[PDB]
Design a protein around this ligand. Structure first.
Ligand SMILES: N[C@H](Cc1cc(C(=O)O)nn1-c1ccc(F)cc1)C(=O)O
Lengths: 278, 269
């Protein structure tokens, strides 16, 4: 019937995962199960109960009330957002293409490759490839000349991203020499890149725009900033992934567009995404 | 042969007269790129069309291998649903649903009301609403007392039968604002923009992709700087529609390979 399997993926502030009250899920959370492995030498595991809240979770609750459906939420055990490995998808996209989930809710970026194998709702938050620097650094966007030809400047700018994601893949195909130079400055994760900028070892960090805006808005002392949204490269958005030809796409689209038009979207973005800075 | 409809809205669609021999003037950008021009019939002369959306239409034409004829919307509007009882859409929305056009290539805002009758591509431009004024007059933003509780002393409006008009009708909270606006709205952005330079209009609530560009060129004008509401432009197709998937897939490809940025560099920056 209209009881749906829904996959998600932890990424604050869009999806935040908590343990159960010792002592049912608490307040702002919904139940979300996670298949946890026993060790790394076996497929054997146990369904752990957890609690999920956040921006995208509130979206899920508003869609459930509006589009009128019930769901079993679960976190993806293998992969992150979705990557075709040897023509075989993993992550949240994998759960949809191989029909373990009828929709995927999270910080899931709409791109061309995934839209070939899944259907995406309208985007409910803008994102893209953006740049974050320390206050006082002057850069335009990804396509700035100090990124495409770093050695045209002395000293060359030090900038990198977190590899093996959509960012590194996008840069490699669009700017081969930029990707070649910036390999040396690959960051372990988002938090490591922030510390690298704060301590002066990095001059710029290229990444997901919605993530960088959230970090710059929460940064202590507000020393880290992103470029203007007008210079965001490959503009797109987070959307809900559904199965190809899914009957739910139409009602999800109109409901999502309603939330944008009646202010319910802007409310969620100040409850989850707006911070101290600006 | 796809019937494309569009509308005069710089810097997305420029409309300029035809040369004596029925052709368009060849032009290059200052960066040495050819300005592609297409013949667009409109209120019923053939005219020269170019801009952000025209470049996009050409890419979509060649990517998907289709020919087209381009015409300007008959009544000059973007399109709102109105009562006749029965209802009908005006503007470009009416021509798409009626068959006068197979596809809308314009700065057409995606919203719930239009999405119930037509198919929208994924957005080719991410954008929002802002306010444009003349230099000299300064407004806090959307919440300046001069617009919250209005007056005849300070006039402010948007374009008639547009997505902005829909935005200010649906909201029970913007009733006091829309009251002031409906008695002052304009038939086109260019007329409203010109009215602000003539001081007959004091504020213009409109698309930031247009207003900011109008400020970067006409230095006798500035905008608020805020974006009190965000929305995107999409390609409009009928409910069927064999083109919906590939047009959309091609918009996503054009964002990801830097094509949309080059368009922004050519027309909006
Ligand atoms: N939500 C992630 C995408 C995100 C992960 C990373 C990364 O690890 O490189 N960079 N992006 C990103 C890339 C291009 C865009 F236009 C917007 C965001 C996803 O869905 O995969």
């Amino acid at each position: 019937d209209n009881h749906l399997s829904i996959v998600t993926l932890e990424e604050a502030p869009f999806v935040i995962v908590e343990d159960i009250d010792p002592l049912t899920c608490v307040r702002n959370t919904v139940p979300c199960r996670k298949f946890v492995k026993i060790n790394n030498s076996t497929n054997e595991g146990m369904n752990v109960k957890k609690c999920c809240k956040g921006f995208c979770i509130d979206i899920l609750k508003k869609l459930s009330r509006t589009v009128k459906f019930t769901y079993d939420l679960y976190l993806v055990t293998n992969g992150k957002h979705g990557k075709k490995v040897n023509n075989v998808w993993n992550g949240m996209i994998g759960e949809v293409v191989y029909q373990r989930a009828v929709m995927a809710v999270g910080s899931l970026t709409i791109n061309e490759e995934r839209s070939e194998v899944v259907d995406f709702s309208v985007p409910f938050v803008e994102t893209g490839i953006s740049v974050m620097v320390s206050r006082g650094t002057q850069v335009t966007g990804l396509s700035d000349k100090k990124f495409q030809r770093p050695h045209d400047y002395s000293p060359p700018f030090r900038f990198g991203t977190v590899p093996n994601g959509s960012t590194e893949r996008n840069i490699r195909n669009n700017y081969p020499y930029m990707h070649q130079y910036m390999t040396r400055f690959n960051q372990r994760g988002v938090e490591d890149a922030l510390v690298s900028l704060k301590t002066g070892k990095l001059d710029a960090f290229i990444y997901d725009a919605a993530v960088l805006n959230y970090k710059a808005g929460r940064d202590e002392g507000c020393k880290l900033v992103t470029i203007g949204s007008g210079y965001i490269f490959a503009t797109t958005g987070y959307g809900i992934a559904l199965q190809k030809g899914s009957p739910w796409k139409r009602q999800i689209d109109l409901a999502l567009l309603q939330f944008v038009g009646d202010g319910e979207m802007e409310e969620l973005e100040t409850l989850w995404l707006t911070g101290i800075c600006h | 042969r796809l019937k494309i409809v569009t509308i005069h809205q710089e810097p997305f669609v420029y409309v300029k007269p035809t040369m004596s021999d029925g052709t368009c003037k060849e032009e290059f950008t200052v960066n040495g790129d050819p300005v592609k021009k297409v013949i667009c019939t409109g209120p019923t002369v053939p005219q020269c069309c170019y801009g952000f959306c025209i470049d996009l239409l050409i890419k979509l034409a060649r990517t998907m291998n289709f020919t087209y004829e381009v015409h300007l919307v008959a009544d000059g509007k973007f399109g709102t649903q109105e009562r006749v009882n029965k209802k009908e859409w005006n503007g470009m929305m009416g021509e798409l649903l009626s068959g006068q056009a197979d596809m809308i290539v314009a700065p057409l805002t995606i919203n719930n009301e239009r999405a119930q009758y037509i198919e929208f591509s994924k957005p080719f431009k991410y954008q929002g609403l802002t306010i444009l004024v003349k230099k000299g007059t300064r407004i806090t933003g959307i919440n300046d007392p001069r617009l919250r509780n209005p007056s005849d002393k300070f006039i402010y409006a948007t374009v008639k039968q547009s997505s902005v008009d829909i935005y200010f009708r649906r909201q029970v909270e913007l009733s006091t604002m829309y009251r002031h606006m409906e008695k002052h709205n304009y038939e086109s952005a260019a007329e409203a923009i010109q009215a602000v330079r003539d001081n007959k209009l004091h504020a213009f609530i409109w698309d930031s992709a247009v207003l900011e560009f109008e400020a970067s060129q006409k230095c006798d004008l500035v905008t608020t700087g805020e974006l009190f509401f965000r929305s995107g432009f999409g390609i409009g197709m009928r409910k069927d529609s064999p083109w919906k998937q590939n047009v959309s897939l091609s918009i996503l490809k054009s964002h990801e390979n830097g094509f949309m940025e080059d368009l922004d560099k050519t027309w909006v920056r």
